[PDB]
Amino acid sequence: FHEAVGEIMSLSAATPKHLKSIGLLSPDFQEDNETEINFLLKQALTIVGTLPFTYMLEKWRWMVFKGEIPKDQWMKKWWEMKREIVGVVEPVPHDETYCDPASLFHVSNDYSFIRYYTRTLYQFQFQEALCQAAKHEGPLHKCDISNSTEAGQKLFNMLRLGKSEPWTLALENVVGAKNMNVRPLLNYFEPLFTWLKDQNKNS
Ligand SMILES: *[C@@H]1O[C@H](CO)[C@@H](O)[C@H](O)[C@H]1NC(C)=O
Ligand SMILES: *[C@@H]1O[C@H](CO)[C@@H](O)[C@H](O)[C@H]1NC(C)=O
Ligand SMILES: [Zn+2]
């Protein structure tokens, strides 16, 4: 929750609407659909890039800790999972002597990694929610929650809650749902999704 709340503010502030309203961006600057596509793809290379990697890493760690993977089949299973979840193949073969996942900082320093997954969703579930109280009409990526007191009050109703109540109840106070949902992310990236589908006709 902490990082999602921190991140939605930056997501809204980076919009060209707030930039042209703050004076940094000249008012005589109309955003072309090409620039919107470029910005969406730059965002996706981070947001949608990290999701399969995070999910695969956490699944491998859970399967190791649960004993489903034998100690002599770790790297085999790891590079098997990476070839069908992340879609990434190792350039050179690795035996059980390697510990490639341990080369990551969060693995060798004993940090839970699933946090970076849910945080990627929650923010969008927040953002898509906060644009409803802000009465946004256009695409989600152009939404700005500024100047709208209703969205701020809806957010604060959960912010003041803290840990006193279950996180599901906190979600229902903003997104109106008890379980995490991925539909806001797809709604956010739909303009990029259509363009990507159109660009891959022959590939
Ligand atoms: C919010 O209100 C201020 C005050 O009039 C205005 O300057 C600004 O353009 C409005 N919109 C945004 C996105 O800041
Ligand atoms: C932007 O819209 C124009 C008008 O339909 C179109 O010709 C152009 O291909 C579009 N570009 C992108 C990146 O969507
Ligand atoms: Zn932070």
Swiss-Prot record:
The extracellular region of the ACE2 enzyme is composed of two domains. The first is a zinc metallopeptidase domain (residues 19-611). The second domain is located at the C-terminus (residues 612-740) and is 48% identical to human collectrin. Keywords: Carboxypeptidase, Cell membrane, Cell projection, Chloride, Cytoplasm, Disulfide bond, Glycoprotein, Host cell receptor for virus entry, Host-virus interaction, Hydrolase, Isopeptide bond, Membrane, Metal-binding, Metalloprotease, Phosphoprotein, Protease, Receptor, Secreted, Signal, Transmembrane, Transmembrane helix, Ubl conjugation, Zinc. Changing R119G: Increases very slightly the interaction with RBD domain of SARS-CoV-2 spike protein. The active site is at H106 (proton donor). Proteolytic cleavage by ADAM17 generates a secreted form. Also cleaved by serine proteases: TMPRSS2, TMPRSS11D and HPN/TMPRSS1. Phosphorylated. GO terms for cellular component: apical plasma membrane; brush border membrane; cell surface; cilium; endocytic vesicle membrane; endoplasmic reticulum lumen; extracellular exosome; extracellular region. Its main location: membrane. The chain holds residues 400 to 602 of 805 of the full protein. Induction: Up-regulated in failing heart. Expression is induced by IFNA and IFNG. Exposure to cigarette smoke increases expression in lungs. Expression is decreased in nasal and bronchial epithelium of individuals with allergy after allergen challenge. IL13 stimulation decreases expression in nasal and bronchial epithelium. (Microbial infection) In airway epithelial cells, expression is increased upon influenza A virus infection. It comes from the Eukaryota. Belongs to the peptidase M2 family. Glycans are attached at N33, N147. It is found in: Cell membrane; Cytoplasm; Cell projection, Cilium; Apical cell membrane. Changing H106A: Complete loss of enzyme activity. Disulfide bonds join C131-C143. This is Angiotensin-converting enzyme 2. An engeneered stable, dimeric and secreted receptor with combined mutations that increase the affinity for human coronavirus SARS-CoV-2 spike protein shows potent SARS-CoV and SARS-CoV-2 neutralization in vitro. Essential counter-regulatory carboxypeptidase of the renin-angiotensin hormone system that is a critical regulator of blood volume, systemic vascular resistance, and thus cardiovascular homeostasis. Converts angiotensin I to angiotensin 1-9, a nine-amino acid peptide with anti-hypertrophic effects in cardiomyocytes, and angiotensin II to angiotensin 1-7, which then acts as a beneficial vasodilator and anti-proliferation agent, counterbalancing the actions of the vasoconstrictor angiotensin II. Zn(2+) binds at E3. Chloride binds at W78, K82. GO terms for molecular function: carboxypeptidase activity; endopeptidase activity; identical protein binding; metallocarboxypeptidase activity; metallopeptidase activity; peptidyl-dipeptidase activity; transporter activator activity; virus receptor activity. GO terms for biological process: angiotensin maturation; angiotensin-mediated drinking behavior; blood vessel diameter maintenance; entry receptor-mediated virion attachment to host cell; maternal process involved in female pregnancy; membrane fusion; negative regulation of ERK1 and ERK2 cascade; negative regulation of smooth muscle cell proliferation. Homodimer. Interacts with the catalytically active form of TMPRSS2. Interacts with SLC6A19; this interaction is essential for expression and function of SLC6A19 in intestine. Interacts with ITGA5:ITGB1. Interacts (via PDZ-binding motif) with NHERF1 (via PDZ domains); the interaction may enhance ACE2 membrane residence. (Microbial infection) Interacts with SARS coronavirus/SARS-CoV spike protein. Substrate binds at Y116. Expressed in endothelial cells from small and large arteries, and in arterial smooth muscle cells (at protein level). Expressed in enterocytes of the small intestine, Leydig cells and Sertoli cells (at protein level). Expressed in the renal proximal tubule and the small intestine (at protein level). Expressed in heart, kidney, testis, and gastrointestinal system (at protein level). In lung, expressed at low levels in some alveolar type 2 cells, the expression seems to be individual-specific (at protein level). Expressed in nasal epithelial cells (at protein level).
